[PDB]
């Protein structure tokens, strides 16, 4: 499981079709299309939230971690949630993906391209006045056959999705350099970063509505309607 | 055959075709005697039907006719952008024909 | 014809509009000899049924209850809201006749 | 008509209610012919079945029989907690009459 | 029987393999009356058909025809990636005769 | 009845009990003229058929082809578990009897 502070209540989250990342309104918005990059997130902090700028949406590996995130960026707000999440594919360890040039190592924080689906969220706690409320509320629609099985994705396939800007030393170098988009290692590097984790987010879209869009596929009486 | 919904669509006549490009606002569906069909909203405010089945239709009509009531209330469900929507504006509300979606 | 739910319940003798707006609470189907049914209630504790096709049912509403029925079974497992409903008050439970969903 | 299972149930022989409150554990389903049925199971050791048509079943149950089996399989699927089901305990496994889920 | 996509297509004149490894773009559904079809159109800018019922459609046919439709707008709907397609290239837009998914 | 797919199996000549415990890799669907079929496999290697009614089918069996369609469509979209596989082994793919998912 993954834990995220959040003043986005449970309701908004629903509305949304899970947790955004900075200006991404629905979770299948393909017309508001988002900048994503790796490297470009894990370094941008934010104010009132924890990172989730440049179409990732940053999460520790811990409630207490998760809680004193929570403390610092939220101190002033009388309620704000902590949500816990099914690990899956989308989700990249930092620390792995980035290496030695991961700019807040000591975070650990493992972040979700393209957001996190409402489905994959298994519950949340609320904080009033920075206090845990130890009592862990369900999430209706997490589906635990899908989730109950999946896991992070291995750094192996994150290495092309770093975002390492063209002349990064990392693109010269093990591993990265085995992995480098067409252009890294010219606007086109960042360009094809942007189009590669475009790609690798829609496929993981599709599984997603394999699950949940299914849930309304009604069956028909062929011989009945022929 | 016709290769798009507009070509399909202008193969008949007082029909119409409408880009409406959202997802469905409403969903009415009714089994009510004499009244079995289905109307669907947008928010732009049009209204549309898919009409009961009658003398108007053809046999081949009759098992399409129900396949596109299927596919509006799965396509209102999953809030799925409506491209195009070809209808008989002689009906009121005006009843659909032919409906795209794209990606 | 009928452009919204109100509209098309109006045209009927012993019918009524439940404003639901909520989702379903539970939902019963049955297979039973001379009772194959379905029954859903909501948490105000209202009950309807989708009655067992009879005399009452003209031909061309037998394919309509059960699209009815299947519309019932999706809405119930995907807590999908309910805005209103249309039915006949002269049943025990009231008898479903059209039902509209939004957003 | 019945309001709920259990007044439902309360009106055939050799039925019987079973609280099961909980998801389905395994789906059995068969095309072989004379066995062309579903079987269910719960972790408690339940086994329930939806019969084989037969002489037993009336015209309007052959419907109904196709549509418990679509039931069966969709809330397999989903994970759906079923709340109770409506039993003939004169056959085995028992037979299902109607099923109840809630929430 | 055959054991693959291609094994099959090969079993029939006028067909030929298209491998499109892409979800579908566009969906096109009509109920008009001797058009009641459907269309498919892919990134790539290739049209694909489901033919409109007819003699060339042996009465084993029918029933495939229906669930190859009902195939396609659930593959649209969820953006599943469709592998291969055996068509017949004598018609324009060329015919969908078989459809392979994989993952 | 049988209780178990693994009983009923047993029930026939020519069968045999697969025990899958992994999800379908490819879907293959056909509406080729007398190739009305489905044909799936597994990363083991494996490759099954659901096959195309036939002399050797009976009546009730035409119903329970189509539904097995159906199930089996749903579960490679779902990416859902197949636990176990009876089938008539008799033929080239082998042939789907019944179908067995748990969790
Ligand atoms: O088919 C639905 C559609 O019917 C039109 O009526 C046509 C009819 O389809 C055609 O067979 C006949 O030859 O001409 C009619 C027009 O005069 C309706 O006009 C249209 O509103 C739909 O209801
Ligand atoms: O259509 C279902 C509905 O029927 C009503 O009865 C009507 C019937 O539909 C109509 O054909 C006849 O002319 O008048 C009947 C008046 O009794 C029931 O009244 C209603 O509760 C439903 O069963
Ligand atoms: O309807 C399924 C149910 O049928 C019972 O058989 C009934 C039969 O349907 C009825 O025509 C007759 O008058 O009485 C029989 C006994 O009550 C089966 O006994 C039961 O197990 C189910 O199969
Ligand atoms: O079945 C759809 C398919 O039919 C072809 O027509 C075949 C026909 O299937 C066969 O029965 C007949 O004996 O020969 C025809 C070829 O001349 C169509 O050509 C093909 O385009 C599809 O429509
Ligand atoms: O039911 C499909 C199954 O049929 C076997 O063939 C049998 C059939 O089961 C029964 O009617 C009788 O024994 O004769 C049929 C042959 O005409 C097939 O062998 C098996 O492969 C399946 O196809």
Redesign the pocket.
């Known amino acids: 499981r993954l834990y995220r502070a959040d003043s986005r209540p449970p309701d908004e989250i629903k509305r949304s079709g899970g947790l955004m990342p900075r200006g991404h309104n629905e979770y299948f918005d393909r017309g508001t299309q988002m900048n994503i990059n790796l490297y470009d997130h894990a370094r941008g902090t934010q104010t009132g939230f924890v990172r989730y700028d440049d179409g990732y949406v940053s999460t520790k590996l811990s409630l207490r971690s998760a809680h004193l995130a929570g403390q610092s960026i939220l101190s002033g707000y009388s309620t704000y949630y902590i949500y816990v999440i099914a690990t899956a594919p989308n989700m990249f360890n930092v620390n792995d993906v980035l290496g030695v040039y991961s700019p807040h190592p000591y975070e650990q924080e493992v972040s979700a391209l393209g957001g996190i689906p409402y489905s994959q969220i298994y519950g949340w706690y609320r904080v009033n006045f920075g206090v845990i409320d130890e009592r862990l509320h369900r999430n209706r629609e997490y589906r635990d056959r899908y989730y109950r099985n999946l896991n992070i994705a291995p750094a192996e396939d994150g290495y092309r999705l770093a975002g390492f800007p063209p002349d990064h030393q990392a693109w010269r170098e093990e591993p990265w350099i085995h992995h480098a988009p067409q252009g890294c290692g010219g606007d086109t590097c960042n360009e094809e970063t942007q189009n590669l984790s475009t790609i690798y987010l829609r496929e993981y879209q599709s599984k997603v509505k394999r699950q949940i869009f299914s849930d309304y596929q009604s069956e028909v009486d062929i011989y009945n309607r022929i | 055959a016709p290769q798009t919904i507009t070509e399909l669509c202008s193969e008949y ?2 029909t119409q075709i409408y880009t409406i490009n959202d997802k469905i606002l409403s969903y009415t569906e009714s089994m009510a005697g004499k009244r079995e069909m289905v109307i669907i909203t947008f928010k732009s405010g049009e209204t549309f039907q898919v ?1 009961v089945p009658g003398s ?3 046999d081949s ?1 009759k098992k399409a006719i129900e396949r596109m009531k299927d596919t509006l209330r799965i396509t209102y469900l999953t809030e799925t952008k409506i491209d195009k929507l070809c209808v ?1 504006n ?2 009121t509300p005006n ?1 659909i ?1 032919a409906i795209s979606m794209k990606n």
């Open positions: 006549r007082n009409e108007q239709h053809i009509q008989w002689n009906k009843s024909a």
